[PDB]
Design a protein around this ligand. Structure first.
Ligand SMILES: CC(C)(COP(=O)(O)OP(=O)(O)OC[C@H]1O[C@@H](n2cnc3c(N)ncnc32)[C@H](O)[C@@H]1OP(=O)(O)O)[C@@H](O)C(=O)NCCC(=O)NCCS
Length: 216
């Protein structure tokens, strides 16, 4: 139920009843800086974006770090299988024209390219959809501890693989030191929509989305 990872930080599982405080934290410290969100307009995520993240909570695969009764970091993960490339591609279509559509446009291209259940001959993968740390607590292994917690949850659940799309260079550096394997790089300047326009325009130093996997 509770994993002390410092003297004052506790890692807890998110319950289906406590999602508002998780979304408040994400809206403050995940979405404004996450490169796909920051690289598309308007700045704030669409309802369908926020609702998709929260739809992972029933899986028991979402975790927060608590300091003095408050969320200071969070990770949102959920399962996927070999249907995910077809599903994401049709979801990207459904929302084409808006912000969530643009985000899905990129993420679907990456999912199709990586296709990790077919790639590594595994029946399923635990995919990390969001990772955020309060800026005042960054550099203190909170991202790492949350990722390790997802990996252990993945092990209990029988998953043989964890995947994550590091849209941020800081997340790429984190999972590199956790020993993840880089399997795909897509530079944002290389990803166009059908009209030939760059879909995602995030601030430097975020130049690419780098997808990593960890074998469990
Ligand atoms: C990605 C993220 C969770 C990593 O934070 P973290 O786990 O605390 O990062 P690390 O422990 O690996 O810190 C390594 C160094 O990089 C810095 N660092 C981490 N994130 C940073 C960020 N957005 N911006 C600038 N520096 C950052 C740390 O302060 C630390 O530097 P220091 O040792 O001199 O103090 C965090 O950057 C974040 O929440 N970003 C906003 C949301 C986002 O982009 N999520 C993408 C998920 S793919």
């Amino acid at each position: 139920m509770a994993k002390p990872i410092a003297d004052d930080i506790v890692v807890r599982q998110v319950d289906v009843g406590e999602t508002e405080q998780l979304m408040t934290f994400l809206l403050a410290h995940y979405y404004p800086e996450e490169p796909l969100t920051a690289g598309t307009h308007p700045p704030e995520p669409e309802a369908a974006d926020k609702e998709f993240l929260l739809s992972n909570v029933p899986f028991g695969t979402c975790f927060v770090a608590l300091h003095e009764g408050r969320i200071v970091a969070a990770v949102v993960a959920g399962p996927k299988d070999s249907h995910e490339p077809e599903h994401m591609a049709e979801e990207a279509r459904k929302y084409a024209g808006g912000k969530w559509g643009s985000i899905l446009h990129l993420l679907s291209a990456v999912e199709t390219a990586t296709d990790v259940c077919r790639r590594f001959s595994v029946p399923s993968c635990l995919h990390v959809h969001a990772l955020g740390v309060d800026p005042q607590l960054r550099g203190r292994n909170l991202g790492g501890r949350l990722m390790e917690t997802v990996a252990q949850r993945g092990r209990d659940l029988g998953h043989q693989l964890v995947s994550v799309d590091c849209t941020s260079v800081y997340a790429a550096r984190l999972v590199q030191r956790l020993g993840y394997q880089l399997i795909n790089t897509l530079r944002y300047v290389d990803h166009l929509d059908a009209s030939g326009q760059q879909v995602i325009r995030p601030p430097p130093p975020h130049e690419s989305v780098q997808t990593f996997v960890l074998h469990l």
